[PDB]
PDB file of C-alpha atoms (C1' of nucleotides) and ligand atoms in Angstrom:
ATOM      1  CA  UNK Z   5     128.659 136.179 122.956  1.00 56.52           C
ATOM      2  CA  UNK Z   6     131.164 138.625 121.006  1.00 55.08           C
ATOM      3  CA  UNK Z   7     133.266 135.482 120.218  1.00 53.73           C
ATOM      4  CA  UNK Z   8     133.318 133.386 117.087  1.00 53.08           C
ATOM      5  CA  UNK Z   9     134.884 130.386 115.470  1.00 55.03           C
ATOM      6  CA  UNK Z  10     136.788 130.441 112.873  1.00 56.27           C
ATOM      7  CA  UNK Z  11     136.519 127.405 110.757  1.00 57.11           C
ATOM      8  CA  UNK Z  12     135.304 127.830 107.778  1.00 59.29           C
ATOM      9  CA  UNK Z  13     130.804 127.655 107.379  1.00 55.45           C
ATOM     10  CA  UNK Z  14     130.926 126.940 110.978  1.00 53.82           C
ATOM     11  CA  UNK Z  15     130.366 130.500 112.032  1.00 51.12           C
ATOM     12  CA  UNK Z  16     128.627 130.727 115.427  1.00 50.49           C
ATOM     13  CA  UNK Z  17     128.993 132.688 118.998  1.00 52.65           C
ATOM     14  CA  UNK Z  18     130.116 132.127 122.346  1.00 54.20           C
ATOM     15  CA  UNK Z  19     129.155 134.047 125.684  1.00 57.24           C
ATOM     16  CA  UNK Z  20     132.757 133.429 127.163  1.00 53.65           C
ATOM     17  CA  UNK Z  21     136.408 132.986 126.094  1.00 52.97           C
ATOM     18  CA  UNK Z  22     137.051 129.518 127.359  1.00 53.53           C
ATOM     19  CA  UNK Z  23     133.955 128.643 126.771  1.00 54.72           C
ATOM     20  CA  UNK Z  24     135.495 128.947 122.820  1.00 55.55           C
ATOM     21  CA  UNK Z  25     138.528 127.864 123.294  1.00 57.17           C
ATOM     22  CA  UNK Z  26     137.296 124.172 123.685  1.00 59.93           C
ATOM     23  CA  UNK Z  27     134.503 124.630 121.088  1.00 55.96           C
ATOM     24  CA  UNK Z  28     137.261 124.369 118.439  1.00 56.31           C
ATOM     25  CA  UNK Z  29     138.445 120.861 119.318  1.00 56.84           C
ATOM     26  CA  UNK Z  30     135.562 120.242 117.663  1.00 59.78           C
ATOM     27  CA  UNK Z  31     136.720 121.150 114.442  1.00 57.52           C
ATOM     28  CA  UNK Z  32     139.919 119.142 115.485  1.00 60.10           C
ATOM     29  CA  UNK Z  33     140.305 117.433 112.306  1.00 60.61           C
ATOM     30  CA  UNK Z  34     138.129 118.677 109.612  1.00 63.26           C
ATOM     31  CA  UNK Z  35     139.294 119.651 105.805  1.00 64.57           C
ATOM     32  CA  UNK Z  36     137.511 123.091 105.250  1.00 67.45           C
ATOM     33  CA  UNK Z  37     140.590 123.385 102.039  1.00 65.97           C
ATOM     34  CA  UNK Z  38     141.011 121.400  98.840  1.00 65.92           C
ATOM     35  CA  UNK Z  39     142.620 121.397  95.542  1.00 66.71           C
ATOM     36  CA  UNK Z  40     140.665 123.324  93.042  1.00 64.58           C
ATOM     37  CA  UNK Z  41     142.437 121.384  90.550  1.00 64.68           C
ATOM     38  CA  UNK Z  42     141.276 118.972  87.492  1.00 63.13           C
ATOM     39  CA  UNK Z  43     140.544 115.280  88.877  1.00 63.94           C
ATOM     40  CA  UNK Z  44     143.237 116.144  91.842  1.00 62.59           C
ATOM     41  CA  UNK Z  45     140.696 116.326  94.715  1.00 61.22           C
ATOM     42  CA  UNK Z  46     142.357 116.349  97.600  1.00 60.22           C
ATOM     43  CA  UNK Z  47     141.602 117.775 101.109  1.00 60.25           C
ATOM     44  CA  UNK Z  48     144.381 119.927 103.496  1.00 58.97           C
ATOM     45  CA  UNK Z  49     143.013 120.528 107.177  1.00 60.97           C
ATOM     46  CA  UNK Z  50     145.823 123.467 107.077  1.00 59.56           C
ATOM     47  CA  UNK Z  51     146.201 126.588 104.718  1.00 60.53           C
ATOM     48  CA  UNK Z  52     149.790 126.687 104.698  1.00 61.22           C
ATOM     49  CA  UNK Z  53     149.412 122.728 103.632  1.00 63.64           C
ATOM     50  CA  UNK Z  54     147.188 123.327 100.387  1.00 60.79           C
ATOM     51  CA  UNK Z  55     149.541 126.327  99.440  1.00 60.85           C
ATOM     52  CA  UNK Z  56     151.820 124.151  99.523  1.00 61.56           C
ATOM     53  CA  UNK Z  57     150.256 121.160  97.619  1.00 59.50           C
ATOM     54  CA  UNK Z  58     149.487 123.927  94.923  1.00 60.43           C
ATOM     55  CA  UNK Z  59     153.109 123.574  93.792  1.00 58.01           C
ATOM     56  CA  UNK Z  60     152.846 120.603  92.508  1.00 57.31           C
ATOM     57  CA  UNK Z  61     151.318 121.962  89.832  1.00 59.30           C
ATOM     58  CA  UNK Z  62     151.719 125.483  89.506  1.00 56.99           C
ATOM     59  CA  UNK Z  63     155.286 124.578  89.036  1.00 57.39           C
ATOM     60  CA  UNK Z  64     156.822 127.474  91.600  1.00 60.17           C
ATOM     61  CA  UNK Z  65     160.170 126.651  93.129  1.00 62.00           C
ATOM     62  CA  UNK Z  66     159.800 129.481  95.595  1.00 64.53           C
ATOM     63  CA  UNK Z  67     163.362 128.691  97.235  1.00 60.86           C
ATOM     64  CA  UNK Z  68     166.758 128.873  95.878  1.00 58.04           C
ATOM     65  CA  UNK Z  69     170.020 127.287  96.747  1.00 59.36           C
ATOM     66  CA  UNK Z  70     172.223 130.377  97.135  1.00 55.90           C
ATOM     67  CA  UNK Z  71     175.594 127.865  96.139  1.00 61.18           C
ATOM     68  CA  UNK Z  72     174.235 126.023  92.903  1.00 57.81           C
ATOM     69  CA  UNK Z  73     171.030 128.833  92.318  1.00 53.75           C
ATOM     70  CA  UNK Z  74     169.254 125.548  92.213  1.00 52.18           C
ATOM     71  CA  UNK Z  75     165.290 126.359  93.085  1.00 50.81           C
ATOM     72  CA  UNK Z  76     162.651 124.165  95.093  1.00 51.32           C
ATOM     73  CA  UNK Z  77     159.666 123.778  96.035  1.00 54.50           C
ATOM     74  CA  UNK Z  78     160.089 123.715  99.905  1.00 54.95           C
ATOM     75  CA  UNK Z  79     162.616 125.403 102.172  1.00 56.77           C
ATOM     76  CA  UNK Z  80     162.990 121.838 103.739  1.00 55.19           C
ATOM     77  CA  UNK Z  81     164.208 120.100 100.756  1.00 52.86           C
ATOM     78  CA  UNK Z  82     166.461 123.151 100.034  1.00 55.38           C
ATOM     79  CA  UNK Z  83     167.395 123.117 104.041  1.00 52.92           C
ATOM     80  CA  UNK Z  84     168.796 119.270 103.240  1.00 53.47           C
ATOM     81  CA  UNK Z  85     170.186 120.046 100.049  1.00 57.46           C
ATOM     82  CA  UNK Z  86     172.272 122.748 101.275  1.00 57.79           C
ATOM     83  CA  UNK Z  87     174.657 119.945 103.367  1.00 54.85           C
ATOM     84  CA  UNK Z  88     174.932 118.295  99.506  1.00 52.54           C
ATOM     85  CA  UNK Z  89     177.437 121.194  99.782  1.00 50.27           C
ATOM     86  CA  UNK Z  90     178.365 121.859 103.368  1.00 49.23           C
ATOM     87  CA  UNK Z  91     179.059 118.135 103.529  1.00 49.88           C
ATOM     88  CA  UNK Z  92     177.163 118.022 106.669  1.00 52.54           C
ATOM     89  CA  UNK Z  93     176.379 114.394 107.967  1.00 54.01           C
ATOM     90  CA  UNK Z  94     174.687 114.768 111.754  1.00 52.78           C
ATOM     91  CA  UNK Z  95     173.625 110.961 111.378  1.00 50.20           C
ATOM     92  CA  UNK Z  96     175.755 108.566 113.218  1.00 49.64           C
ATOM     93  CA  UNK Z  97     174.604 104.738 112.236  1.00 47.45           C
ATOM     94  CA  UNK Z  98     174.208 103.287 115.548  1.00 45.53           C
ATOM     95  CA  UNK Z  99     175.509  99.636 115.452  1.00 47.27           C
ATOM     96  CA  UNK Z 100     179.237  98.619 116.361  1.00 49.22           C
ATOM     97  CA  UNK Z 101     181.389 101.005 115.403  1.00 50.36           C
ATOM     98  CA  UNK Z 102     179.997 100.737 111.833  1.00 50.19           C
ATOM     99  CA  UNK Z 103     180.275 104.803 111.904  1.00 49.16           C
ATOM    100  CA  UNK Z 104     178.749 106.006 108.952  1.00 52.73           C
ATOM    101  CA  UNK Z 105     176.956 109.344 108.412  1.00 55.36           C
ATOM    102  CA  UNK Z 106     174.345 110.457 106.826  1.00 57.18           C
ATOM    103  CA  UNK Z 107     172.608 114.290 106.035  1.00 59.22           C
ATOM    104  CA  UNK Z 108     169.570 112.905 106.352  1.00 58.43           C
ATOM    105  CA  UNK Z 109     167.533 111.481 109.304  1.00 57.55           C
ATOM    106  CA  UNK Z 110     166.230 108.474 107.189  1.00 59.66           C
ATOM    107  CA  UNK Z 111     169.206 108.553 104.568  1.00 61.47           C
ATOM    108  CA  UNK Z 112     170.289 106.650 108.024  1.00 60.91           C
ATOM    109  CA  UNK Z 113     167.663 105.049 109.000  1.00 58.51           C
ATOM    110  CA  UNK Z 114     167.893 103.309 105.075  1.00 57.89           C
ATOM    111  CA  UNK Z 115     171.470 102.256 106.424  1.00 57.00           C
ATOM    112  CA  UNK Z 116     170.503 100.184 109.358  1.00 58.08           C
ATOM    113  CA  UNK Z 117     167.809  98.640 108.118  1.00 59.81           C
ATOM    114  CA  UNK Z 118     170.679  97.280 105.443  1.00 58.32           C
ATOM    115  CA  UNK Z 119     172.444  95.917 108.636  1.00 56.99           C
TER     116      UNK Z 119
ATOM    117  C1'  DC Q   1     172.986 104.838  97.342  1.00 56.22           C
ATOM    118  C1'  DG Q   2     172.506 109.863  97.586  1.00 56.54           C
ATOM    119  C1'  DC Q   3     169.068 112.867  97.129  1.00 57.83           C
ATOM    120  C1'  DG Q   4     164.901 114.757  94.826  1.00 55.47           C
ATOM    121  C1'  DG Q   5     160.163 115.700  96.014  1.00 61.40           C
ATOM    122  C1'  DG Q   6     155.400 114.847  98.090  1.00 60.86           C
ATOM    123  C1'  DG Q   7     152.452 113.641 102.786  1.00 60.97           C
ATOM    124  C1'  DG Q   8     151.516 114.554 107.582  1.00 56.99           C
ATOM    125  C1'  DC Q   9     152.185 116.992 111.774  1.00 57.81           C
ATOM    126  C1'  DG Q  10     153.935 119.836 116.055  1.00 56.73           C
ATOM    127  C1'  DT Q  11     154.949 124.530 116.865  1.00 53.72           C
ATOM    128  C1'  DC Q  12     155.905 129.788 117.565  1.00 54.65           C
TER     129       DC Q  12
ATOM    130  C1'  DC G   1     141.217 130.368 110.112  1.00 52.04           C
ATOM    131  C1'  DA G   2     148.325 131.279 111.105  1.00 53.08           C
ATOM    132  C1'  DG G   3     152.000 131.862 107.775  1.00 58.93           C
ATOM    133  C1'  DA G   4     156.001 129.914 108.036  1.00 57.84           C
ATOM    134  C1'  DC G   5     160.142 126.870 109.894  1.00 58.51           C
ATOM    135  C1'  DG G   6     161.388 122.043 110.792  1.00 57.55           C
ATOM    136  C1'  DC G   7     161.101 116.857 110.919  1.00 58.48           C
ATOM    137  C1'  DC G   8     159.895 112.300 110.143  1.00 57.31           C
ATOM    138  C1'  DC G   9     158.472 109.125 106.564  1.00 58.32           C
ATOM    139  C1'  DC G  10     158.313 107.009 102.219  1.00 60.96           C
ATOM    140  C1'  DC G  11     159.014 106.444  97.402  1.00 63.32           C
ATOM    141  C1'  DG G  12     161.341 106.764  92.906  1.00 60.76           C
ATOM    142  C1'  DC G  13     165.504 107.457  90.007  1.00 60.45           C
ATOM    143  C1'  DG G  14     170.255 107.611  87.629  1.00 58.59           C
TER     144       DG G  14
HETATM  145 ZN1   ZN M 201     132.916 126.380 114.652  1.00 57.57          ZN
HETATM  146 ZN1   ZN M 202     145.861 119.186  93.653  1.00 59.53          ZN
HETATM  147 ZN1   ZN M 203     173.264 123.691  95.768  1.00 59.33          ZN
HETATM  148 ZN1   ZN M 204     176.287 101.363 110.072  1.00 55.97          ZN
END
DNA sequence: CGCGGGGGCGTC
DNA sequence: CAGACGCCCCCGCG
């Protein structure tokens, strides 16, 4: 039993590989992470997720538009508001020939639900 | 109404 | 524990 999982204070062995590899599931959907903040207790299965969450507070803006050296706290966000310049509009309303765009998946989806 | 900003989640 | 990119979703605001 070399092998271990890694979850966090669920540290234990297993003879095999595979025999690992579907111990894990277990741990499927626990929150070993949360927010080490005052009266903000909230859980994050992921790491990357809680780093993130951290932001709220901390304050960090980590990304920066390179046009108006606008900062963010997520590359997403920034992703979108780049087409505030590029003008970029990749969502066609569907109905009759009512063709709008929009930047933004649900910017659209707004739209037709106002049909 | 366009877009900021936070949640959750699949993925290499 | 795999950090990081990418989306959908949903809400609030000037
Ligand atoms: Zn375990
Ligand atoms: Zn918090
Ligand atoms: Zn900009
Ligand atoms: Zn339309």
């Amino acid at each position: 039993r070399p092998f271990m999982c890694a979850y966090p204070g669920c540290n234990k062995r297993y003879f095999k590989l595979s025999h690992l590899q579907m111990h894990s599931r277990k741990h499927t959907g626990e929150k070993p992470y949360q927010c080490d903040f005052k009266d903000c207790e909230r859980r994050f299965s992921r790491s990357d997720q809680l780093k993130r969450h951290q932001r709220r507070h901390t304050g960090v803006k980590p990304f920066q538009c390179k046009t108006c050296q606008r900062k963010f706290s997520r590359s997403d966000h920034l992703k979108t508001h780049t087409r505030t310049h590029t003008g970029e509009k990749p969502f066609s309303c569907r109905w009759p020939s009512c063709q709008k765009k929009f930047a933004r998946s649900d910017e659209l989806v707004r739209h037709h639900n106002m049909h």
